[PDB]
Design a binder for this molecule. Structure first.
Ligand SMILES: *[C@@H]1O[C@H](CO)[C@@H](O[C@@H]2O[C@H](CO)[C@@H](O[C@@H]3O[C@H](CO[C@H]4O[C@H](CO)[C@@H](O)[C@H](O)[C@@H]4O[C@@H]4O[C@H](CO)[C@@H](O)[C@H](O)[C@H]4NC(C)=O)[C@@H](O)[C@H](O[C@H]4O[C@H](CO)[C@@H](O)[C@H](O)[C@@H]4O)[C@@H]3O)[C@H](O)[C@H]2NC(C)=O)[C@H](O)[C@H]1NC(C)=O
Ligand SMILES: *[C@@H]1O[C@H](CO)[C@@H](O[C@@H]2O[C@H](CO)[C@@H](O[C@@H]3O[C@H](CO[C@H]4O[C@H](CO)[C@@H](O)[C@H](O)[C@@H]4O)[C@@H](O)[C@H](O[C@H]4O[C@H](CO)[C@@H](O)[C@H](O)[C@@H]4O)[C@@H]3O)[C@H](O)[C@H]2NC(C)=O)[C@H](O)[C@H]1NC(C)=O
Lengths: 213, 213
């Protein structure tokens, strides 16, 4: 064939925070040197739009260019299920490649957030684990972060945490876990930690759950 | 080209338990009706073997057969890093397709297992969540299960649990979480639950961590 197209959704956090701005990204790979001509046509539910923006092309070590087309979207357009289509055309293609992406369908469901202290057996070590359980949400688009009331003297570098991907639960909903690693002295001195979750189905798209000794 | 080949590693649990038998699986898709002839040649570190077994072909909705070749492997052969090669040949191919798979390289690291009781705020609900943290292991091949001392009268159907995929941690090791959902009355009556973890770097490839009220 010829070039390949891939269309990605906006960041879950971008569509949920008022401060941020979501965008859809249409990437084009496998584009030839002989015909590096690429065009884009964007359609929101079958209605063309021309506010998208194409970034400069870039060569890769595999001797192929890379074209990307970014389309900023309204917060509530995506959350209401509007479908976004990217139409790519180039000489190397017999017919243009059209791709579409939208939010997962299904009545959203609200997550429950639970913080669990570190296991008693983990204090033998110096780094202990604070856990945040987020369960029962749909769709799986979600954002998770940790906060502290600890000054930089205890945390000169920021907080160290990692979050699992969403896992389909036995009731059609999703769950995940996020682990925050902190020194034991910080846990013992009464530091207040906070698990923050952004999800469509939450009121104000946000909830925050605390954890401390 | 023609048909496509895919080679899969043995289940982590299969290579760790003596009772089970691990297998490398070499799948062939996109095989034509005009030429449904397939051959396999297996090599363990460049040494041919003839104990593999081919299962009957199966028709697909897209009108393509699918041929599978299964090779049982010795437990310690895989765990010691031996590379397994699958060579596929068919009329529709100009030259045979060879694929190889082996265990991830790197000094193995032993996991730590910690059980966390359900959050106090989750008792509002009837289904509560028991958590098992497994962290600090390498490679990411691991198997996790839950056990109970509860008869079938409390659990006529088995235990309900889901386990996350491994997540790369900030020290090059991996962690995961497994969630067991149980009715609150079972938690309150003293039922003893058990998180069982099978990993190469564990002594006897097995460890078990308990949890109860
Ligand atoms: C006619 O219909 C067929 C069936 O629908 C089509 O077959 C499919 O063909 C595609 C390629 O076009 C293959 O894609 C690959 O999938 C691999 C994963 O396969 C496992 O998981 C899927 C479900 O997720 C499952 O259906 C497979 O059968 C396979 O299951 C595994 O099976 C083994 C033993 O059989 C078992 O031990 C495992 O536990 C089990 N695992 C699971 C999760 O069930 C990928 O690994 C491949 O990835 C490659 O390519 C990626 C990018 O393309 C790259 O990132 C990767 O690194 C890697 O290189 C690849 O995506 C499907 O597997 C195959 N499905 C089946 C059932 O055969 C057929 O293509 C279609 N005809 C045509 C013309 O399209
Ligand atoms: C020249 O070199 C560049 C970089 O090495 C290659 O760019 C990649 O090309 C492959 C072509 O297959 C693309 O593969 C697709 O990747 C997607 C992942 O997107 C994430 O990752 C990229 C980079 O890591 C991020 O930029 C992006 O924001 C995302 O975070 C997958 O989603 C795709 O999977 C889907 O399609 C395949 C094929 O149908 C299915 O098998 C999957 O199941 C799934 O449906 C796919 O794997 C890759 O995206 C390209 N990266 C970038 C950054 O563009 C060029 O391909 C290479 N040139 C040639 C000719 O290959």
């Amino acid at each position: 064939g010829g070039p390949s197209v891939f269309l990605f959704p906006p960041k879950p956090k971008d569509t949920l925070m008022i401060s941020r701005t979501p965008e859809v990204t249409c990437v084009v790979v496998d584009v030839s040197h002989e015909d590096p001509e690429v065009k884009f046509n964007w359609y929101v539910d079958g209605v063309e739009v021309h506010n998208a923006k194409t970034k400069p092309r870039e060569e890769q070590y595999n001797s192929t260019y890379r074209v990307v087309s970014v389309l900023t979207v309204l917060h509530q357009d995506w959350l209401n299920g509007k479908e976004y289509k990217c139409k790519v055309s180039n000489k190397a293609l017999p017919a243009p490649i059209e791709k579409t992406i939208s939010k997962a369908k299904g009545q959203p469901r609200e997550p429950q957030v639970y913080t669990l202290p570190p296991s008693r057996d983990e204090l033998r070590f110096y780094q202990v684990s604070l856990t945040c359980l987020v369960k029962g949400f749909y769709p799986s688009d979600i954002a998770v972060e940790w906060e502290s009331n600890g000054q930089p003297d205890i945390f000169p570098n920021g907080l160290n945490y990692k979050t699992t991907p969403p896992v389909l639960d036995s009731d059609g909903s999703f769950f995940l876990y996020s682990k925050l690693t902190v020194p034991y002295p910080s846990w013992l001195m009464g530091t207040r930690f906070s698990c923050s979750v952004m999800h469509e189905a939450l009121h104000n798209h946000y909830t925050q759950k605390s954890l401390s000794l």
